[PDB]
């Protein structure tokens, strides 16, 4: 979530993802903690047995066979955390995650109901005013002349400066807004 | 692998600004600036029973007796069960009893 995906997944990353998915489906099958610990140690032993491969084409074939075995022996209902996608509490509070720009449309009486918070809100808005031009200049300067670029973004490079495109990250609504 | 230094510095600065923003999301103690209990059986439930039940019961009873019974077939009820040995209140005739019940094995 906080890091952008690359152009492709490396073999090492795919092996780690397969290992994590296999252990999650193993806990979904095993349920009991001692049973899962036993069979997860067995799975870790299998991965360590196939760890030291140098040809790397045999390693790719082994990865393909292993994930084929995983798709054959995957749980029909694997355990999903409630906040995870496909879970029960996933996107439950998007109806309550109101974006911050409605306070610009709030009435002066409602603004007067919260004076100090609103004063801090225009302090933050003034900081955004002052930092936007500098961070646009930084983004234009740090862009490579080549067509290669990723979705990663530079940090602030000197004192009194903010990271470019920081507003939508810093001022995002809370996952427990109420 | 781990974090590259650019994204590590970016996340540290972004998280510090997130700490500042979430601290600024707090409320001062004066915010928001807004412009006979007895016992539960004697006042909490009694007032509710005499206010939100008694007046509606009065209105429904008025409507039922003076705007439904005045009309022919609004309130139509089935005949009540009449058993042998019973006395009819409206007519005054007693229902004759049954036969001699030959089977009394149980």
């Amino acid at each position: 979530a906080f890091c952008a995906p690359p152009a492709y997944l490396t073999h090492q990353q795919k092996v780690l993802r397969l290992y994590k998915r296999a252990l999650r489906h193993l806990e979904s099958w095993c349920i009991h903690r001692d049973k899962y610990r036993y069979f997860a140690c067995l799975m870790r032993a299998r991965f360590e047995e196939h760890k030291n491969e140098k040809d790397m084409m045999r390693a790719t074939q082994l990865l393909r066979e292993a994930e084929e075995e995983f798709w054959q022996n995957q749980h029909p209902q694997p355990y999903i955390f409630p906040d995870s996608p496909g879970g029960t509490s996933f996107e439950r509070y998007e109806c309550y995650k109101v974006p911050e720009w409605c306070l610009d449309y709030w009435h002066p009486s409602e603004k007067a109901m919260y004076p100090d918070y609103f004063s801090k809100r225009e302090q933050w808005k003034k900081l955004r005013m002052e930092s936007w031009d500098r961070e646009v200049k930084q983004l234009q300067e740090e862009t490579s002349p080549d067509g290669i670029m990723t979705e990663a973004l530079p940090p602030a490079r000197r004192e009194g400066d903010l990271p470019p495109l920081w507003w939508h990250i810093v001022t995002r609504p809370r996952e427990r807004p109420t | 692998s781990g974090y590259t230094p650019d994204e590590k510095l970016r996340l540290q600065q972004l998280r510090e600004l997130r700490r500042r923003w979430l601290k600024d999301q707090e409320l001062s103690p004066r915010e928001p600036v807004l412009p006979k209990n007895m016992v539960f059986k004697a006042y909490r439930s009694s007032l509710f029973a005499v206010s939100h039940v008694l007046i509606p019961m009065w209105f429904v009873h008025y409507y039922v007796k003076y705007h439904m019974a005045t009309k022919p077939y609004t309130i139509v009820s089935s005949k009540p069960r009449i058993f042998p040995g019973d006395t009819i209140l409206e007519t005054g005739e007693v229902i004759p009893p049954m036969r001699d019940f030959p089977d009394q094995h149980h």
Partner: peptide, 13 residues
Amino acid sequence: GKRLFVVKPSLYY
């Protein structure tokens, strides 16, 4: 205590 602001739309109108 430790209560936080709740962001809401303009219900005034």
